[PDB]
Amino acid sequence: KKLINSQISLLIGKGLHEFDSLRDPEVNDFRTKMRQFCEEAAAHRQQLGWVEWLQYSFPLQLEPVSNRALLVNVKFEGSEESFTFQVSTKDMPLALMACALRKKATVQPEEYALQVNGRHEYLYGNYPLCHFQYICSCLHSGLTPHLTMVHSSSILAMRDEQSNQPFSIELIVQAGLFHGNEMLCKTDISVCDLPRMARLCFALYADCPIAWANLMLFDYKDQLKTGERCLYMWPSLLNPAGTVRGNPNTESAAALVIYLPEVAPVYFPALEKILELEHEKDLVWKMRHEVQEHFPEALARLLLVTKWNKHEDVAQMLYLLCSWPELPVLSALELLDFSFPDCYVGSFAIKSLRKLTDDELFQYLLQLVQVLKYESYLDCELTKFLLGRALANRKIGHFLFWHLRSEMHVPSVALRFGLIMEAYCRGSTHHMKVLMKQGEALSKLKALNDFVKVSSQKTTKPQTKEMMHMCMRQETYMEALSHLQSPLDPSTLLEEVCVEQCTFMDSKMKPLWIMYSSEEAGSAGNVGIIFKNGDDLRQDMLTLQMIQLMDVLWKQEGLDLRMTPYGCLPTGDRTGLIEVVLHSDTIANIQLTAAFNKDALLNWLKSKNPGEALDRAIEEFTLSCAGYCVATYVLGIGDRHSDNIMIRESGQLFHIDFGHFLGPFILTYDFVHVIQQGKTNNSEKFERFRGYCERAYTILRRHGLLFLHLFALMRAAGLPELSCSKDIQYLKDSLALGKTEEEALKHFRVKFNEALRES
Ligand SMILES: C[C@H]1Cc2ccccc2N1C(=O)Cc1nc(N2CCOCC2)cc(=O)[nH]1
């Protein structure tokens, strides 16, 4: 009744009064309508069935002839006593639950769910036990799974307690009219001709650019803007992609007072009113009905040919779009680009993305948050979609919050991002409290890192480590750093902080290595996190999400290349978290017993995998080496050394620290020796690896457009190595999109020979 308003303010890092002090009708209208939208979603959520609630709160953690049957440990809610019994690998959770209730009575299964001990996870649904991530990881590490039988009533109890004339302007400076990236007229247009998404872009210069400012010609209520407007500029020539809202720093920002002449109130024609009304481009526009009927996927090309300045062509295009059938995910993601800015085009693109699954949405969520930067008005279809999907799934809501929270320091998005988070919080009061615990933990991690930064300059490395340990052992710090959901994976619980296992890197920004343990979770609760303050993790997150996509796409064609796309999450201004892949070490640390460096990797794997286990480790290495050889070549991952390439004790080879991408790969004889089983020349084993590399490269080539589309949507992020058209050009060259399957295979073989030649 009083705290919520201050709770949101502390969580978002901005006071709610700052939105009210703006005296903006658009801001207030978004706040009232989205609060209503999010509260209704929260009400529907409180009436869900116990499994439907689990599908929201604990979404299934799944993996992307037998012969097998493995052991399991099961306990109940009240009693501490556990029952150990062997079950089948093919068996479903209901079979385990029925077996658990039989052993309980001696010492109905449909009314239960299997809680994963010391983890924010549940084992439910019609899936074989081996398909669940927890059981699979337990099987691949020789661990006994610990589960708890939780009755339907208990899940509902948890659900209940977690409730809530030519255009003219008087310049009182370069002016230009835009409908996205293309000029509507000269830097020459009628008022009736003006489209709904028309932008008036300014540039103040002396050659030396000073500042820029953009504005919408129509308001959020569809009415044409009149008359006087003070434009607070952003520092810089003409920038149409930039935000339509002024600089919040009114004290130092240069302004631009302009007057919009009163032509008559004039509102843009409504839906029903619209419905009534070089040589290649003209031919495509002529065949607009044939494209609507026979080629629906060619909509993007049809929107690029239509005259956005001519109002007759726009209304003609809109009627075709109003009757246009549903388009695939790939085509819909292409339409969210700044080249297609029309509101009705955006609404059609969102409706085509309603068929996305929670897992599909999660993969593109990073790009969807980036599209919000291109949005002109606060109340848009993308915001309604993201909020609605985040309210339906707690894991989606988690990452949507963190993706917006990490950009709060940026003034251009702080208002939009802060309002969406406030709306989400009105929808989920309990999850808001859960995220506050994560925010308070990161607050103490920042303070601890600041302390380590100062202490390192004053004393030696082991003295700074004991200094770090004393700071952690503080009552407030121990409570804040412990018993929370992992921001990198909400399914993982960060229980007891292991102060003695915690350390720092003696280099520039001094990153922290934080270790955790869990009595309840056992060995699964042993988790590590790298906290980085001062280094930017946006480029690292993108590269890892692309490697994850590569892995997903390969698996969709039946190819498992045993990749390691570990979690990376920026949380604030040059602040973020990295997931520690335990039981893994760098090539450099392994090199620091092999007589020669070419034998180092195999010798290390021999000691970790003795006997028959070695053959699997060699296969794990070969598949992962092939996967990363293609991944590093395609994405253009440079600055590669022995300290940024890691290997798991199980065999898997993986890359770390992605500071430079998009402009050849690392194929050292250290890798070849493991692939060839230790033999000087093993053609059979190397040609299979070459074959696996060729297969990996060809599967990505067919999905080349998807990589290009996602990299095009990531131009909004403001990445230094991904901002212009020439940056994405590396993917066109590396994947060889113009070439055919055999033309690119010969090109890749020369590059494969080149990486092996210079070794
Ligand atoms: C060099 C290691 C040891 C260490 C100790 C304290 C703080 C940071 C770090 N480290 C790093 O920051 C390196 C580093 N490690 C990374 N890893 C992610 C995969 O799991 C293993 C760790 C990813 C990455 O991008 N950089």
UniProtKB/Swiss-Prot annotation:
Q: Which residues form the PI3K/PI4K catalytic domain?
A: 498-759
Supply one GO molecular-function term: ATP binding
Describe the location of the PIK helical domain by residue ranges.
Answer: 278-427
Species the sequence originates in: Mus musculus
Q: Which InterPro entries match?
A: ARM-type_fold (IPR016024), C2_domain_sf (IPR035892), Kinase-like_dom_sf (IPR011009), PI3/4_kinase_cat_dom (IPR000403), PI3/4_kinase_cat_sf (IPR036940), PI3/4_kinase_CS (IPR018936), PI3K-type_C2_dom (IPR002420), PI3K_ABD (IPR003113)
State what protein this is by name.
Phosphatidylinositol 4,5-bisphosphate 3-kinase catalytic subunit delta isoform
EC numbers on record: 2.7.1.137, 2.7.1.153
From the UniProt record, list the coiled-coil ranges. Answer: none
Q: Which Gene3D superfamilies match?
A: 3.10.20.770, C2 domain (2.60.40.150), Phosphatidylinositol 3-/4-kinase, catalytic domain (1.10.1070.11), Phosphatidylinositol 3-kinase Catalytic Subunit, Chain A, domain 4 (3.30.1010.10), Phosphatidylinositol 3-kinase, accessory domain (PIK) (1.25.40.70)
**Keyword terms, alphabetized:** Adaptive immunity, ATP-binding, Chemotaxis, Cytoplasm, Differentiation, Immunity, Inflammatory response, Innate immunity, Kinase, Lipid metabolism, Nucleotide-binding, Phosphoprotein, Transferase
- UniProt-annotated stretches for the region G-loop: 504-510
Supply one GO CC term from the record: cytosol
Q: In which pathway does it act?
A: Phospholipid metabolism; phosphatidylinositol phosphate biosynthesis
What protein family is recorded?
A: Belongs to the PI3/PI4-kinase family.
- Reactions catalysed according to its record: a 1,2-diacyl-sn-glycero-3-phospho-(1D-myo-inositol-4,5-bisphosphate) + ATP = a 1,2-diacyl-sn-glycero-3-phospho-(1D-myo-inositol-3,4,5-trisphosphate) + ADP + H(+); a 1,2-diacyl-sn-glycero-3-phospho-(1D-myo-inositol) + ATP = a 1,2-diacyl-sn-glycero-3-phospho-(1D-myo-inositol-3-phosphate) + ADP + H(+); 1-octadecanoyl-2-(5Z,8Z,11Z,14Z)-eicosatetraenoyl-sn-glycero-3-phospho-1D-myo-inositol 4,5-bisphosphate + ATP = 1-octadecanoyl-2-(5Z,8Z,11Z,14Z-eicosatetraenoyl)-sn-glycero-3-phospho-(1D-myo-inositol 3,4,5-triphosphate) + ADP + H(+)
Q: Which PANTHER family match?
A: PHOSPHATIDYLINOSITOL 4,5-BISPHOSPHATE 3-KINASE CATALYTIC SUBUNIT DELTA ISOFORM, PHOSPHATIDYLINOSITOL KINASE
**Per the database record, which ranges form the C2 PI3K-type domain?**
165-261
PI3K-RBD domain location, by residue?
Answer: 67-151
List the subcellular locations. Answer: Cytoplasm
Spans annotated as Catalytic loop: 636-644
**Gene Ontology biological-process annotations:** adaptive immune response; B cell activation; B cell homeostasis; cell differentiation; cell surface receptor signaling pathway; chemotaxis; defense response to fungus; homeostasis of number of cells
Q: In which tissues is it expressed?
A: Abundantly expressed in adult mouse spleen as well as in testis. Isoform 1 is expressed in spleen and lung (at protein level). Isoform 1 is expressed predominantly in leukocytes.
User: Any known activators or inhibitors?
Assistant: Activated by growth factors and cytokine receptors through a tyrosine-kinase-dependent mechanism. Activated by RAS. IC87114 inhibits lipid kinase activity and is selective in cells at doses up to 5-10 uM. Among other effects, IC87114 reduces allergic responses, prevents the recruitment of antigen-specific T cells into target tissue, and affects natural killer cell chemotaxis.
Upon deletion of the gene, what happens? Null mutants are viable and fertile but display defective adaptive and innate immune responses due to signaling defects in multiple cell types including B-, T- and mast and natural killer cells.
Q: Which SUPFAM superfamilies match?
A: ARM repeat (SSF48371), C2 domain (Calcium/lipid-binding domain, CaLB) (SSF49562), Protein kinase-like (PK-like) (SSF56112), Ubiquitin-like (SSF54236)
